[PDB]
Each structure stands twice: as C-alpha cells, then as structure tokens.
Amino acid sequence: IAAHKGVNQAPVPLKMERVGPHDVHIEMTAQITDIEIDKGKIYKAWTFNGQAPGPLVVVNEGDTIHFTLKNMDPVVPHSMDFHAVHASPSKDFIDVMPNKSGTFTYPANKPGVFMYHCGTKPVLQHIANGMHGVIIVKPKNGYPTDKEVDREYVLIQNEWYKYNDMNDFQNGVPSYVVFSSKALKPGDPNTNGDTFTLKEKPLLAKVGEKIRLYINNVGPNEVSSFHVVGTVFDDVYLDGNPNNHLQGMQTVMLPASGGAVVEFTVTRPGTYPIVTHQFNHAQKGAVAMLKVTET
Amino acid sequence: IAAHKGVNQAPVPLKMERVGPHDVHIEMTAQITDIEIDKGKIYKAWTFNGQAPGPLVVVNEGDTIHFTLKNMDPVVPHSMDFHAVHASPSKDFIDVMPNKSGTFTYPANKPGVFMYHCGTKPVLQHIANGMHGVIIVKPKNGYPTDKEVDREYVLIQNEWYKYNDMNDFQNGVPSYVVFSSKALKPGDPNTNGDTFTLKEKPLLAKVGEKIRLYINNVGPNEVSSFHVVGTVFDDVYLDGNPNNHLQGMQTVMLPASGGAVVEFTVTRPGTYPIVTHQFNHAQKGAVAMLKVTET
Amino acid sequence: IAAHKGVNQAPVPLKMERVGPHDVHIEMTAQITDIEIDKGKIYKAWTFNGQAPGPLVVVNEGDTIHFTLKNMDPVVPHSMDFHAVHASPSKDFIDVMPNKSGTFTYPANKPGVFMYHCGTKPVLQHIANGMHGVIIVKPKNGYPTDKEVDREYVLIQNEWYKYNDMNDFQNGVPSYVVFSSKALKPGDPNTNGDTFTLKEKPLLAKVGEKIRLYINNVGPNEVSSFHVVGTVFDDVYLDGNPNNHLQGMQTVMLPASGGAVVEFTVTRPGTYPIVTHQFNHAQKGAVAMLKVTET
Numbered sequence: 096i097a098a099h100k101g102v103n104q105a106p107v108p109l110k111m112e113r114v115g116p117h118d119v120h121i122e123m124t125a126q127i128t129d130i131e132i133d134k135g136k137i138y139k140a141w142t143f144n145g146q147a148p149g150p151l152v153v154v155n156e157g158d159t160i161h162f163t164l165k166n167m168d169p170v171v172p173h174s175m176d177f178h179a180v181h182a183s184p185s186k187d188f189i190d191v192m193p194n195k196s197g198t199f200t201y202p203a204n205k206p207g208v209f210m211y212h213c214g215t216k217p218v219l220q221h222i223a224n225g226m227h228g229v230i231i232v233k234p235k236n237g238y239p240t241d242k243e244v245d246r247e248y249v250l251i252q253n254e255w256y257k258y259n260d261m262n263d264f265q266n267g268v269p270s271y272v273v274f275s276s277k278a279l280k281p282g283d284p285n286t287n288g289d290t291f292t293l294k295e296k297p298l299l300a301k302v303g304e305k306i307r308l309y310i311n312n313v314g315p316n317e318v319s320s321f322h323v324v325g326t327v328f329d330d331v332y333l334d335g336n337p338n339n340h341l342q343g344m345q346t347v348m349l350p351a352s353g354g355a356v357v358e359f360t361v362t363r364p365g366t367y368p369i370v371t372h373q374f375n376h377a378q379k380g381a382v383a384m385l386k387v388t389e390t
Numbered sequence: 391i392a393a394h395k396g397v398n399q400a401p402v403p404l405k406m407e408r409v410g411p412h413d414v415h416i417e418m419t420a421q422i423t424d425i426e427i428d429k430g431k432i433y434k435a436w437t438f439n440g441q442a443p444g445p446l447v448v449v450n451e452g453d454t455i456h457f458t459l460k461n462m463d464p465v466v467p468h469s470m471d472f473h474a475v476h477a478s479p480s481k482d483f484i485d486v487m488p489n490k491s492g493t494f495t496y497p498a499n500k501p502g503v504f505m506y507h508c509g510t511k512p513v514l515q516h517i518a519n520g521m522h523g524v525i526i527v528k529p530k531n532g533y534p535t536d537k538e539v540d541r542e543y544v545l546i547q548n549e550w551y552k553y554n555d556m557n558d559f560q561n562g563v564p565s566y567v568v569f570s571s572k573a574l575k576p577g578d579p580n581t582n583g584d585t586f587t588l589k590e591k592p593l594l595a596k597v598g599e600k601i602r603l604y605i606n607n608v609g610p611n612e613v614s615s616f617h618v619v620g621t622v623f624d625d626v627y628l629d630g631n632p633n634n635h636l637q638g639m640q641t642v643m644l645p646a647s648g649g650a651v652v653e654f655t656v657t658r659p660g661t662y663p664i665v666t667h668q669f670n671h672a673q674k675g676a677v678a679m680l681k682v683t684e685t
Numbered sequence: 686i687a688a689h690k691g692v693n694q695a696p697v698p699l700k701m702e703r704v705g706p707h708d709v710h711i712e713m714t715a716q717i718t719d720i721e722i723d724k725g726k727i728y729k730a731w732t733f734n735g736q737a738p739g740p741l742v743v744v745n746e747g748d749t750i751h752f753t754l755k756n757m758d759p760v761v762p763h764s765m766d767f768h769a770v771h772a773s774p775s776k777d778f779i780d781v782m783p784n785k786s787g788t789f790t791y792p793a794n795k796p797g798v799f800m801y802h803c804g805t806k807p808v809l810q811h812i813a814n815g816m817h818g819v820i821i822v823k824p825k826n827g828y829p830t831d832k833e834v835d836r837e838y839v840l841i842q843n844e845w846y847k848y849n850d851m852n853d854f855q856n857g858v859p860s861y862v863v864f865s866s867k868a869l870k871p872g873d874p875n876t877n878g879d880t881f882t883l884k885e886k887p888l889l890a891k892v893g894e895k896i897r898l899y900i901n902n903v904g905p906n907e908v909s910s911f912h913v914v915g916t917v918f919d920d921v922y923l924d925g926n927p928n929n930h931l932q933g934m935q936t937v938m939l940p941a942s943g944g945a946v947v948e949f950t951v952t953r954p955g956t957y958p959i960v961t962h963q964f965n966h967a968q969k970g971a972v973a974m975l976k977v978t979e980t
C-alpha cells in the first residue's frame with residue numbers, strides 16, 4: 096500500500112478510565128507499526144496502539160464500555176469488535192475513516208477472556224495483519240479457585256503470514272505462530288507476538304506456586320492445543336466463564352478466538368515450556384517459557 | 391463420470407410420516423443435482439434429495455426410524471449413516487445399487503444434533519461431493535432453557551473442494567466453506583451450502599429475542615470455531631445433549647461432524663454476522679447474516 | 686543420518702515393576718526400528734522400545750514413577766516427557782546421550798489418558814519420527830460408569846510425514862494418519878501406527894456390550910474428531926479425568942495430545958468402523974474396525 100511505505104507510527108499507550116461504578120472509557124488507536132515477529136523479520140503490522148496483539152483491556156462484569164477508536168492509518172478504515180459485548184455489529188462495530196475518530200458504547204455482561212479485533216471487511220485481512228487482542232471481564236463473584244492462585248499472567252497465541260498477502264492468508268500455512276504476554280500488574284512483561292521474546296525473557300514464578308494464565312488464541316485461522324510442559328491443569332474455565340469448569344486437563348483445545356482460564360502448580364525449580372501441542376506451530380515459534388526459582 | 395454428464399436430477403421432497411408413537415418412516419433419494427455453491431460456480435453434487443447439505447430430519451428421542459434410500463444415481467452406489475442411531479454399520483448402512491431401493495430400521499435413543507451422511511467407500515468422496523446433512527433428535531424432557539427461547543433456526547457448515555477430485559479432497563485446502571439453513575417451521579428458509587444466500591437473504595429476528603441455533607459442522611475435513619458477532623452464547627449444549635451444558639461462550643469448537651445447540655440474545659437492531667472464526671474459512675464463504683429488526 | 690543407515694534395532698519389551706505401594710520402576714529404550722506404516726512403506730522410526738507409538742504404560746493415581754531411558758540410538762540424544770507427571774522439564778525431561786542411560790523420578794497425581802513423548806529439540810522432529818505414546822493413570826476412585834463396562838481397549842491416533850523431513854513436518858499435510866492399539870490385558874492386540882492392521886484384524890467384542898476406549902491423539906500436528914460408526918458415546922471423560930463428564934456425544938474433539946475415556950454400546954452384530962471424522966485423515970489411514978459377534 097503506497098501510503099504505508101515508510102510508515103512506522105510509534106506506539107501510543109492505551110487510555111482507560113473509570114467514569115462510574117459500572118462505566119469505563121477506553122481510547123485506542125488504529126496505527127501502522129513495524130514489529131519484529133522473528134529475528135531479522137519485520138512485519139509492518141496493522142495494529143491497535145502499535146502492539147500486535149493489541150493492549151490488554153480489563154473490565155468488570157457489568158461494565159458498560161464507551162470506546163473510542165482514533166484511526167491514524169492514512170488510507171485504510173478500521174473498526175473494533177469486542178467479543179465481550181452485546182452490540183449491533185452494523186451500528187456499533189462500524190468503520191472509522193482515516194484521520195477520524197468514532198465512539199461506540201456497549202455492555203460487557205459476561206465474565207471471561209474474550210478476543211477483540213478489527214471488524215472491517217475483509218476481516219481476515221485486518222486480523223491477519225495484526226488487529227487482534229484480548230479483553231478480560233472479571234467475574235462479579237470471582238472463580239472458586241481464586242484463593243489458591245499465587246501468580247497470574249496473560250498469554251495470547253496468534254499467527255503471522257506473508258505480508259498483507261490475501262492468497263496466503265486464505266490458503267497458506269502460517270509462517271510463524273507465536274505467544275505474547277500482556278501486563279496485568281505493574282512489572283509484568285508486555286510483549287508482542289514474536290518467536291523469541293518469551294524464550295529469552297521467560298515469565299517468572301516461584302517453586303510451589305499455583306499459576307493462573309488468562310489465555311486466548313486469536314488465530315486468525317488455527318486452533319490451539321494449549322499445554323504447559325511438566326504440569327497438568329488443575330482447573331480450567333472455558334472462555335473464562337466460572338461455570339465451564341474442567342479439572343485435571345493435560346491440554347486445552349482452543350478454537351480460533353477461544354479463551355480460557357487455566358491453573359496449574361509448578362512443583363520444582365526449572366524452566367517450563369508453554370506450547371501449542373500442534374508441534375508444527377510450536378516449531379514455527381509458539382513456545383514461551385516459564386522460569387521457576389526458589390525466590 | 392461419463393454417466394453423470396448432463397445429469398441434473400430435480401430435487402425431490404423428503405418424505406416422512408409417523409407410523410406409531412415411537413416409529414417414523416423416512417424416504418430419501420440419492421441423486422445428482424447441480425448446485426450453485428458460489429456465484430457462477432456450479433457443483434454437480436452427489437446429494438440426498440437434490441439438496442447439499444440434505445434435507446433436515448427431525449425425530450423425537452426414542453423414535454425408531456424405518457429409512458428408505460431410493461438410489462437415482464445411474465452408476466454409483468450410495469448409502470445412509472445417521473449418527474443419531476445405534477445400528478450395525480455392515481448390515482444397516484450398506485449400499486443401495488443404482489436404480490434400487492433399500493430399507494433399514496434403527497433406533498434414535500439419544501437427543502441432539504447429529505450429522506448424517508453417505509457411508510459408501512470412499513466415504514471422503516461421498517461426503518465431499520455433497521452427501522451430508524443433519525438429523526435433530528428432540529429430547530424427551532426438553533432443554534432447561536426452552537422457556538427462554540423466542541426463535542430458532544438450523545445452520546450447517548460444510549466445505550467444497552475441486553470437483554470430484556480425490557487428491558484435492560485428501561490433500562488440498564477447501565475452495566469454499568459455507569453455511570446453509572434448513573427449515574424447522576413453515577416459512578423458515580431452506581437453503582444449500584453456498585457462499586451467498588444467507589448474506590443476501592439473512593435469517594430474521596426481533597430486537598431483544600433469545601435465539602436458538604441447532605448447528606452442525608459436517609466437514610468433511612475442517613473443524614469449526616462457531617461465533618455470532620455482537621453477542622455471547624448464553625447457553626450451549628454440546629451435541630445437543632442437554633447434559634453437556636456450557637455458559638457464556640464466545641465461540642464453540644465443533645469437530646468435524648460435531649453439533650451443538652447454542653442460544654444467544656440479540657439486544658439491538660442491526661445485521662449480525664455468523665461466522666466460523668477460522669477466518670480463512672470465513673473469507674471463503676462461511677459468513678451468514680442474522681437481520682434483527684424492531685418488528 | 687548416515688549412522689542410521691541399515692539400522693533396525695529389534696523391539697525390546699517394556700520393563701516395569703512395582704517397588705512400593707505408591708512407587709513404580711519403568712525402563713524404556715530409545716531405538717531406531719523399521720516399521721511398516723502402510724503396505725510396502727517402511728518408516729525407519731525413532732521409537733521407544735521399537736514400537737510407534739510406544740508401549741503402553743499404566744500406573745495408579747498417586748504413583749511416583751522412577752523412569753529409566755536407555756538410549757540405543759547411535760548418534761541422536763533422546764529424552765522422555767510424560768504429560769501425566771509434575772516435573773521440572775529442564776532437570777527431569779533432559780537428554781540422554783547415545784549409549785547412555787538416565788533415570789528421572791516424578792509423581793503421577795492426576796488420573797487420565799496422557800500423552801508421553803521425547804522432549805529433545807527439535808521436539809517436532811522427535812515426535813514426528815515416532816517418539817510418542819500413552820500413559821494411563823487409573824483413578825483412585827474409578828469412573829462412575831465402571832460397573833457398566835464390559836470390555837476395554839486402548840487406541841492411539843498419530844500422523845506420519847515424509848521421512849525425517851523437517852520442512853514437511855512443519856508445512857506439509859500428513860502422508861498417513863493412523864490408529865494403533867496397545868494391550869491392557871493378556872490377549873489384547875498390541876500394534877503400531879499403520880493404515881491396515883486394525884482393519885484386517887479388527888478389535889473384538891460381543892453383541893450388547895458396553896465398550897470403553899482409552900484414547901489419545903498424539904499428533905504431532907493434527908486435531909482429531911473421534912467417532913465410532915453405528916453408536917453414540919454414552920459417556921465421555923475428557924482427558925480421562927472422571928470430573929470432565931459429557932454424555933451422549935456423537936464425536937469427541939481431541940486436541941493434539943488430547944485424551945479421553947469414551948464409552949459406547951454395540952447393539953447389533955457387525956463390523957463397526959472407528960474413525961477420525963476429519964475424513965481426509967480417515968482416507969489416509971485413520972479407520973480401525975471393531976467386529977461385534979454373538980460370541
């Protein structure tokens with residue numbers, strides 16, 4: 096796209112503020128930003144806020160979201176679809192033109208770990224170029240295992256294809272399949288979907304801890320066979336809904352856009368890989384590490 | 391197949407009648423019928439009754455089915471396998487020769503949303519050419535959410551490949567992935583698996599309604615990441631068995647031949663896409679629309 | 686690999702013995718063994734004990750496993766990862782060099798049907814070449830349906846690719862997809878992953894029996910849409926954990942490495958195919974047979 100040549104828009108922080116007991120404002124950009132998805136491989140990603148996946152959004156069950164998209168793409172329209180919300184797609188997930196903003200309002204009345212993404216046709220194009228992320232809606236009543244959890248992180252799986260190539264996006268195998276982590280609390284890592292960062296800078300935990308991961312597989316196209324090496328999931332809540340409660344799972348099948356809360360105990364010091372067990376994907380990047388130490 | 395050149399057998403209505411409180415007669419054809427699966431693309435489908443997927447069958451839990459297949463294919467044998475039933479495959483899902491009929495009897499003692507398909511070797515060939523459909527077995531005791539449901543429809547996902555090409559069917563990506571709808575009540579649409587009809591003539595609903603969809607992904611080969619845009623599934627029953635009850639799902643993972651009952655509320659007027667969230671498939675046809683109006 | 690030319694190491698029995706009420710010794714080899722995966726097609730598999738998948742391991746919930754790997758590969762390191770166990774991957778699933786042994790100890794405190802596999806980088810290589818299998822951990826309290834089960838078997842699904850070809854393993858469709866059976870009791874068949882043996886020598890059962898299958902899809906790469914023709918699963922326990930209890934499933938979605946216990950009734954004499962309902966895979970080998978007789 097001639098108007099994206101040489102474009103590399105610096106990442107912009109997510110803006111969020113609570114405006115009432117049940118109402119939140121969120122402001123995101125659509126922007127075009129170079130991301131290093133594998134060593135020496137730059138992808139001029141279509142993004143929210145210069146991250147791909149986009150920035151983590153966390154709201155409470157029952158919060159109405161008043162969402163603004165500021166479209167910094169000089170020539171492509173963009174839009175936002177939160178899977179968390181009840182909305183009219185044809186009124187509320189509509190396009191925002193280059194250099195314009197739009198504001199849309201809709202309720203998040205279901206707990207869980209939801210994909211969000213650009214909803215502009217062709218949606219496959221906008222997602223595959225980078226316009227995906229997660230919104231967590233925290234359950235009013237928690238999870239029944241909350242008191243057991245020592246530490247928590249967010250991990251998101253996505254694929255990367257040949258650049259902006261619709262034939263590849265539709266018909267081709269992924270070039271890379273990757274994990275990223277998005278921060279929940281100060282100090283947590285906040286990374287993009289790449290083949291290396293979570294190997295070189297593993298997530299951290301302590302021996303004996305029960306870990307919760309909020310996970311989503313945003314695709315665009317593949318399903319995920321999510322597994323942590325050296326443990327078993329003690330508890331799993333499909334889509335992060337507390338009702339959908341499995342136990343003792345070695346691996347969690349996630350559809351494209353599928354989420355989960357998963358919990359597991361790390362009993363011994365060491366480095367624990369986190370994989371999709373579809374090992375062709377793992378080979379192509381989708382292995383993160385969790386380093387577990389006595390401190 | 392030289393004997394299928396120029397063949398285009400007109401669709402024949404499904405014949406069904408109840409013959410006792412727990413016994414139903416069904417009569418289907420196997421026939422070769424031209425179907426427009428994408429604009430300007432005709433597939434000379436191997437079909438039940440000139441529809442692909444085939445006609446909807448609905449029975450009650452506990453019904454014994456006395457099924458007749460009238461094989462109108464001039465040269466290929468065909469057969470019928472209902473996933474709903476307990477049967478001996480080697481006695482009851484056997485071939486019916488060209489220009490012959492066969493009758494097979496077997497019980498449907500499990501509720502749910504079951505694939506049916508031709509069972510003739512190579513089964514991949516017979517399914518991929520079009521010989522798939524759904525049989526719904528209604529639970530004796532309903533679903534616990536029955537009283538909440540305002541409107542219901544059936545949707546079926548399938549793929550289309552290069553015509554009658556076994557190499558493609560085994561090794562190739564689908565050319566098209568599609569939804570169709572099959573009528574439950576008078577006035578409901580009854581369509582074939584194509585890339586357009588459910589976009590151009592959306593399913594209809596009213597603002598505020600709880601919608602039930604009976605869904606099945608008949609494949610032949612892909613899994614489905616089933617999602618309705620702008621809502622969340624309030625309730626999901628895997629395979630349509632009331633016991634397999636999930637809540638609050640954004641997306642439902644369906645294996646090949648996998649079914650579900652899914653229920654969701656449409657809160658605002660607008661057009662709501664229905665997708666497989668494996669967006670390469672959606673791009674290749676698998677997007678239906680639900681138009682929600684104040685009336 | 687020049688050091689594997691002409692190598693065909695005879696299969697070696699699994700060695701296992703109980704050493705205390707809650708402790709078991711297991712001794713396995715890593716070895717290079719020719720296996721006929723389709724008629725006339727030999728794969729010089731990387732294996733545990735000269736079987737691919739490897740030998741069945743069965744332990745009780747709560748058993749600590751003291752595992753020895755004797756590496757007979759003349760030049761490639763190998764290792765063992767049991768999904769059943771809590772272990773430090775970087776200490777306990779480490780490599781054993783050619784012509785050496787290693788012993789690792791770790792607890793199996795979760796019931797179910799777990800994949801095991803070599804964990805040596807690149808893991809995709811070691812799994813795809815043949816180094817996968819199942820470990821069953823029997824639940825302390827059984828399954829609630831135990832008293833209904835008449836007969837049980839183990840079935841494992843895997844893929845085969847072009848020989849030792851990492852490009853194919855990562856980017857290519859499987860050449861073959863196959864079932865094998867591993868013995869639970871004397872007289873049960875014990876087979877390797879091939880396209881024919883379970884068609885030519887079907888598993889055996891009696892009319893009216895409730896059958897339990899312990900199943901796992903070891904991949905490396907595909908998901909499985911597991912179905913038995915002519916029946917419906919009465920009960921399914923995901924990953925073989927008794928808590929994860931579905932009913933009335935026509936087909937069970939297994940991720941890569943995903944397991945299940947599934948139970949179904951065979952009501953009539955006949956031959957019952959067992960498939961993955963992803964019919965491209967079935968075409969490429971993944972159909973086993975269950976022959977049901979009056980005796």
Ligand SMILES: [Cu+2]
Binds near residue numbers: 116117
């Ligand atoms: Cu309040």
Ligand SMILES: [Cu+2]
Binds near residue numbers: 114120161
């Ligand atoms: Cu506001």
Ligand SMILES: [Cu+2]
Binds near residue numbers: 141172173214215
């Ligand atoms: Cu966009």
Ligand SMILES: [Cu+2]
Binds near residue numbers: 267268269317
């Ligand atoms: Cu793929």
Ligand SMILES: [Cu+2]
Binds near residue numbers: 243244245303304305
């Ligand atoms: Cu703790």
Ligand SMILES: [Cu+2]
Binds near residue numbers: 322372800
């Ligand atoms: Cu593993």
Ligand SMILES: [Cu+2]
Binds near residue numbers: 325326329359360771
């Ligand atoms: Cu664990």
Ligand SMILES: [Cu+2]
Binds near residue numbers: 411412
């Ligand atoms: Cu009666």
Ligand SMILES: [Cu+2]
Binds near residue numbers: 409415
């Ligand atoms: Cu009759």
Ligand SMILES: [Cu+2]
Binds near residue numbers: 436469516521
């Ligand atoms: Cu047929």
Ligand SMILES: [Cu+2]
Binds near residue numbers: 562563564612
């Ligand atoms: Cu595909």
Ligand SMILES: [Cu+2]
Binds near residue numbers: 538539540598600
């Ligand atoms: Cu209503």
Ligand SMILES: [Cu+2]
Binds near residue numbers: 210212617619667
């Ligand atoms: Cu979506």
Ligand SMILES: [Cu+2]
Binds near residue numbers: 181620621622654655
């Ligand atoms: Cu909803």
Ligand SMILES: [Cu+2]
Binds near residue numbers: 706
């Ligand atoms: Cu004891």
Ligand SMILES: [Cu+2]
Binds near residue numbers: 751
């Ligand atoms: Cu010992």
